[PDB]
Amino acid sequence: HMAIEFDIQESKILKGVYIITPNKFRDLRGEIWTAFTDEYLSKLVPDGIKFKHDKFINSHFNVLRGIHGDVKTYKLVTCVYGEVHQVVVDCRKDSPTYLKWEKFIISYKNQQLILLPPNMGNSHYVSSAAAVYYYKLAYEGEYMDAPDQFTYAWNDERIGIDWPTNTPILSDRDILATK
């Protein structure tokens, strides 16, 4: 049988961003795979800080969500249906790579989970008809909702993300940040 395996490597662009590739069992039915075990992936986050919250974000084609982060939250993110351009921005003002970025195109053929430490910009664009984005959160205290998060404009010129469109679907939050 297959053991649960995770390939783990750090980004060559953004210090403290990890790229995790699970193995999969494939057969005539489809696929089974493990996104997370405490035993293997709890080490991606400091001791005392627990993955205690799981979310799904379901978005249509051409939706762009971002760029969003908060001071508290370690994020393990992936796309479990469809295809997203996942873009991590370095939003640590102290970092020598502040406002550098790296793209992961996550889909049926590239199943990566991306580990974001706090003070990072998270963003994704939906290149498939629809996308199911899976989002694990590790944080102390209460959930950091939108009023406690920071926002950079998806198209901030200082960041210069290569997006597949100039005309994404945006929430009012993400529109407001472009002005």
Ligand X SMILES: Nc1nc2c(ncn2[C@@H]2O[C@H](COP(=O)(O)OP(=O)(O)O[C@H]3O[C@@H]([C@H](O)CO)[C@H](O)[C@@H](O)[C@@H]3O)[C@@H](O)[C@H]2O)c(=O)[nH]1
| Binding residues vs a copy of itself (CB under 8 A) | 1, 4, 27-39, 50, 52-60, 63, 65, 80-81, 108, 130, 132, 134, 136, 143, 145-147, 169-171
Among 44, 51, 68, 72, binds ligand X (CB under 6 A): 68
Judged by DSSP in three states, 133 sits in strand
Residue 38's binding partner out of ligand X, a copy of itself, none, with CB under 5 to 8 Å set by partner kind? a copy of itself
Q: Which is nearer to a copy of itself, 9 or 58 (CB)?
A: 58
Residue 6's binding partner out of ligand X, a copy of itself, none, with CB under 5 to 8 Å set by partner kind? none
Q: Is 143 a catalytic residue?
A: no
Q: Is 98 a catalytic residue?
A: no
Report the alpha-carbon distance of residue 116 to residue 77 in Å, rounded: 8
Sign for the CA dihedral angle at 39, 92, 136, 128 comes to negative
Report the alpha-carbon distance of residue 29 to residue 13 in Å, rounded: 37
Of 40, 81, 108, 135, the active-site residue reads 135
Burial degree of 167 (CB within 10 A; 0-12, 13-18, 19+): exposed
DSSP 8-state symbol, 63: B
Residue 23's binding partner out of ligand X, a copy of itself, none, with CB under 5 to 8 Å set by partner kind? ligand X
75 binds ligand X (CB under 6 A): yes
Provide the token pair at 46: 């400091």
Judge contact between 96 and 176, C-beta under 8 A. no
175 binds ligand X (CB under 6 A): no
Of 18, 68, 74, 139, the active-site residue reads 68
Active site amino acids:
68, 135
